[PDB]
């Protein structure tokens, strides 16, 4: 709609995942936001994307934010493989 | 700073102004965020910028979000002139 970008930016900047939602849904939710913002000329590269996903990653997913440092050049895909790996083990 | 963009995006997406802070400070705060994001290759145009400023605009400033509709092509500068106008009169 007229208000889509500002709604994606606010969703992205206030993400909260602890493993209640399926990882499948949480992934395509975040991936779609990054495509929509990118096609609207708001470029959120893998670094800043991953920073925002890992913020408000909580519960048994918290620890991904501490390793994340040794993980520079980490893609969103790579970060979700981890979120998936953790989810399947619950 | 390695973490600047994600910090500006989170600040911008959670703005709250009711007229406690001087408009001067609230303006340069928001303007700086949009420059810093733009110099980091993240362009927030006037439309999306104004939408995010007007969200969490509250108190005697709320009403700017209801008019804002008839105000298409509205710049951030234009929106702050209003915030300033209201602030000088609260004082």
UniProtKB/Swiss-Prot annotation, chain B:
Localization of this protein: Cytoplasm
Assembly, per entry: Homotrimer.
General remark: Retrotransposons are mobile genetic entities that are able to replicate via an RNA intermediate and a reverse transcription step. In contrast to retroviruses, retrotransposons are non-infectious, lack an envelope and remain intracellular. Ty1 retrotransposons belong to the copia elements (pseudoviridae).
Chain's role: Capsid protein (CA) is the structural component of the virus-like particle (VLP), forming the shell that encapsulates the retrotransposons dimeric RNA genome. The particles are assembled from trimer-clustered units and there are holes in the capsid shells that allow for the diffusion of macromolecules. CA also has nucleocapsid-like chaperone activity, promoting primer tRNA(i)-Met annealing to the multipartite primer-binding site (PBS), dimerization of Ty1 RNA and initiation of reverse transcription.
Domain notes: The C-terminal RNA-binding region of CA is sufficient for all its nucleocapsid-like chaperone activities.
Protein name, per record: Transposon TyH3 Gag polyprotein
């Amino acid at each position: 709609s007229d208000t889509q970008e500002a709604n994606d930016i606010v969703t992205l900047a206030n993400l909260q995942y602890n493993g209640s939602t399926p990882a499948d849904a949480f992934e395509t939710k975040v991936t779609n936001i990054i495509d929509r913002l990118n096609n609207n000329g708001i470029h959120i590269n893998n670094k800043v994307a991953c920073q925002l996903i890992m913020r408000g990653l909580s519960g048994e997913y918290k620890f991904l934010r501490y390793t994340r440092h040794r993980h520079l050049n980490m893609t969103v895909a790579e970060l979700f493989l981890d979120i998936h790996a953790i989810y399947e083990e619950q």
